[PDB]
A paper describes a structure:
PII proteins are ubiquitous signaling proteins that are involved in the regulation of the nitrogen/carbon balance in bacteria, archaea, and some plants and algae. Signal transduction via PII proteins is modulated by effector molecules and post-translational modifications in the PII T-loop. In the present study, crystal structures of the [name] [name] from [name] have been determined, namely of adenylylated [name] (adGlnK) and unmodified unadenylylated [name] (unGlnK). The allosteric signal that links effector binding to the regulation of the activity of PII-interacting proteins is primarily transduced via the T-loop, which adopts different conformations depending on the nature and combination of bound effectors.
The protein crystallized in the tetragonal space group P43212 and the final model contains one [name] trimer per asymmetric unit. The three subunits deviate from each other by an average r.m.s.d. value of 0.6 Å (Cα positions). Hence, and as is the case for other PII proteins, [name] from [name] can be considered to be a permanent homotrimeric protein. Three phosphate molecules are bound to trimeric [name] in unGlnK. All three phosphates bind highly similarly and interact exclusively with residues from the B- and C-loops. The phosphates form a direct hydrogen bond to the backbone of Gly87 from the B-loop, as well as additional hydrogen bonds to the side chains of Arg101 and Arg103, which either precede or are part of the C-loop.
Residue numbers in the entry:
A (entry chain A): -1 to 37, 42 to 112
B (entry chain B): 1 to 37, 42 to 112
C (entry chain C): 1 to 37, 42 to 46, 48 to 112
Write the structure that this text describes.
Amino acid sequence: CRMKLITAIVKPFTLTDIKDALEQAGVQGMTVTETQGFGHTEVYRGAEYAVDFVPKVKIEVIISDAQAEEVINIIVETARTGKVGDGKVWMTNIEELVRVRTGERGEAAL
Amino acid sequence: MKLITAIVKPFTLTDIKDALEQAGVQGMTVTETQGFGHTEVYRGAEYAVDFVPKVKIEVIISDAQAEEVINIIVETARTGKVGDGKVWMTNIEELVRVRTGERGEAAL
Amino acid sequence: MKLITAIVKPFTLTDIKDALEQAGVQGMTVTETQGFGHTEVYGAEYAVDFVPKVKIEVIISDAQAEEVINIIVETARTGKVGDGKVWMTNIEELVRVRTGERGEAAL
């Protein structure tokens, strides 16, 4: 069983819907971090400073390769609003996974 | 090169930092992140109203040390109570030190 | 498809974004993160000192990966310790949320 990390950067107000849709599908362990994209600029002692940012959330969930397609579609179809900046979803390969409490590995750790 | 990522209870953070230093492992970075533990309805929409604070720690380590870094994090983050989190490894295909331009193992 | 990640000093952020933008590279996201700089106990130790950094991530094709890495390395460099690191990880699937485009079409 091959592990995969699904990462998505989406608009913040889609978070709860994304959570609920993944829970409904038996997918748990989602974590979320606040992040930013860029929208003008100002100068101060030799550096440029953006004064305008777009708030996003980065969500991550770990699942088996067999669920990956389903999970990606759930996130995409739930995060979409039709406006620019709806975000991206990408997959990365996980070579080893350990559940801290039990020491379980692989599928036993999902 | 390998990236070790772990999401653990916040209060284990500097025990983990100390344990990795003792094993000669440095370069850790930490970001605050949230898990989920309840939901509220407001105008036909659902809003998560309950989050669990965690920290996301990342360390870049040679393949030779990857397994002991994983097991050091696991034993030090472990409380036995639920929510202890997870540790995982992803492959790094290129690594560069910004200041010197060194690449690969020279960049650790 | 490749993910470029960099931990850099926070005052380089908009310069790096400017440089990448001039090279036609878009989609950068940035997250505040912390490195370590003394300690007291409470029964666990507690570090009272952290060094602020910014994590930047940009997704690019294999073809541009080396250009992007050098732009970030060159723009983020100050010459003083703590300048950070840049690393590349493989992306196996990429989807643009608004359209459903995949792969190269999702950049």
